[PDB]
Amino acid sequence: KPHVVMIPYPVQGHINPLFKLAKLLHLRGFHITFVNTEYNHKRLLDFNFESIPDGLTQDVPTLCQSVRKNFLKPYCELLTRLNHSTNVPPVTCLVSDCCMSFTIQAAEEFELPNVLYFSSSACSLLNVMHFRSFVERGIIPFKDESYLTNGCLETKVDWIPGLKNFRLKDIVDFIRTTNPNDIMLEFFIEVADRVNKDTTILLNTFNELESDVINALSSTIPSIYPIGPLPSLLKQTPQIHQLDSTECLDWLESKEPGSVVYVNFGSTTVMTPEQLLEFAWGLANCKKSFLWIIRPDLVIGGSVIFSSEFTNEIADRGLIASWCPQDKVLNHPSIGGFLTHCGWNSTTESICAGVPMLCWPFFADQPTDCRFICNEWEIGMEIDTNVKREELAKLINEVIAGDKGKKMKQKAMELKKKAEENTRPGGCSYMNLNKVIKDVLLK
């Protein structure tokens, strides 16, 4: 029986997509061993969840640092045990998060096929594969902090085939450093160097969404395989719901289609109370209905921003909640827009829901996604880093009732349709996954 060991980078944003893939692989006959760090295994509490220590006393740089040296050993020990266990069949293959590059070494040692899953866009991958070049070209690290204000970030990156209108500012922002020993930069350069012509890499995207970028990547990594978007794939997967083991949706049911702006900046990052205030009043001042998922208590002095004055004002238009089943919300007919940091999971989900976006890029691949969302796909607009209510209210209204908004909804719906055609019989993303399983994962 096929037995795949799966391990994602230790953050929710990476665990979630790989878990979805895990469910797909399980439906396909694979005995699954999903490997979380103790920390993540605690939170979450032929499909077995295992855990390994992360070697820490979470901070991304610190985690990445531990991942580069403290995961190989316990990981291999786990493989050894699984191979000598009487409770489960021996391991036949590995599906590893691209950021967990130590698995490549493990795979060679245990002589096992290892398919990598990159959790971000094809463009982000292309960026990562070139971090090394930015250094060799003498571009990064920058000489000093003045690069943040001297217009250096506006510089166009035109030496990377496949990228059309990119600026240094749009590159996965880990290049933004003045430190030659920067953890993140070195982490990703190591990841990129471990990838070669024989590496099979799965991407949560589809051909049409990133055509030039994908073609460009394929010249270096011929075995890059778009198998997404995951949302559309799972949605159209027979019997997917048997692996499926409130007030918000009720609130939305009475709203006119496309009239509600959905806001959710995730928990992974807490914003400034100054920023928190501009969003609250920007939302209140636009006069549009809105569902805002946020935990004010996390923000220092945040709960105070939600005054009795604010509460009365939004009385007939907005609802603040601590959590919500994002999938069902994004796909609710009342949603007319999605305010987000535009990380990859959010972007693909919004695309699959056919919902225009409003991006507020914070870090990593967010500005990268924003650049495509704004200039390539034209299904959204960008919010200034230093958010201000007046301008925010304007952007929201443009998307919700303006002419630009209608055009973005149109382009979003177009992408939604192709996302779905790609992830069902006859579609390339769908066919690509079948091919990887058949030609690589299976003996």
The number of beta carbons lying within 10 Å of the beta carbon of residue 161 is: 13
Do residues 191 and 274 share a domain? no
Confirm whether 165 is domain-assigned. no
DSSP codes, 30-74 = -EEEEEEEHHHHHHH--EEEEEE-------HHHHHHHHTTSSHHH
Amino acid at 430: Y
Confirm whether 144 is domain-assigned. no
Do residues 234 and 263 share a domain? no
Q: Is the dihedral of CA 431, 437, 438, 440 positive or negative?
A: positive
Do residues 416 and 437 share a domain? no
In angstroms, rounded to a whole number, what is the distance separating the alpha carbons of residues 103 and 107? 6
Look-up of token digits 């990133």: 210
Do residues 315 and 357 share a domain? yes
- Which tokens is 40 given? 């993540």
Confirm whether 164 is domain-assigned. no
Enumerate the active-site residues.
14, 97
Do residues 223 and 333 share a domain? no
The number of beta carbons lying within 10 Å of the beta carbon of residue 215 is: 14
DSSP codes, 431-443 = HHHHHHIIIII--
Confirm whether 223 is domain-assigned. yes
- Which tokens is 232 given? 């559309």
Do residues 65 and 212 share a domain? yes
Confirm whether 163 is domain-assigned. no
**Total domains present in the chain:** 2
- Which tokens is 49 given? 């969840």
Look-up of token digits 């959010």: 346
Do residues 378 and 286 share a domain? yes
User: For strand 335-340 and strand 318-321, is the pairing parallel, antiparallel, or unpaired?
Assistant: unpaired
Quick one: how far is CA 34 from the chain centroid? 19
Do residues 33 and 105 share a domain? yes
Confirm whether 309 is domain-assigned. yes
Range(s) of the domain holding residue 45: 1-137+182-245+423-443
- Which tokens is 208 given? 């049409």
Do residues 239 and 300 share a domain? no
Task: Yes or no: say if 54 and 38 are a contact pair by the CB < 8 Å rule.
Answer: yes
User: For strand 201-203 and strand 114-118, is the pairing parallel, antiparallel, or unpaired?
Assistant: parallel
Confirm whether 322 is domain-assigned. yes
Domain harbouring 240, CATH code: 3.40.50.2000
Do residues 306 and 382 share a domain? yes
Q: What is the dihedral of CA 404, 327, 271, 392, to 10 degrees?
A: 20
Instruction: Tell me how far CA of residue 425 lies from CA of 211, 420, 429, 431, 432, in angstroms.
Output: 20, 10, 9, 7, 11
Look-up of token digits 């919902």: 355
Give the side-chain half-sphere CA count within 13 A for 161.
7
Do residues 221 and 319 share a domain? no
- Structure determined by: X-ray
In angstroms, rounded to a whole number, what is the distance separating the alpha carbons of residues 164 and 142? 23
Q: Is the dihedral of CA 325, 331, 332, 335 positive or negative?
A: positive
Confirm whether 155 is domain-assigned. no
Do residues 220 and 306 share a domain? no
Work out the angle between the directed axes of helices 102-109 and 72-83 (0-180°, nearest 10). 40
Q: Where are the beta strands (DSSP E) in 170-306?
A: 201-203, 224-226, 260-264, 289-293
* Three-state DSSP state, 318: strand
**Resolution in A, one decimal?**
2.1
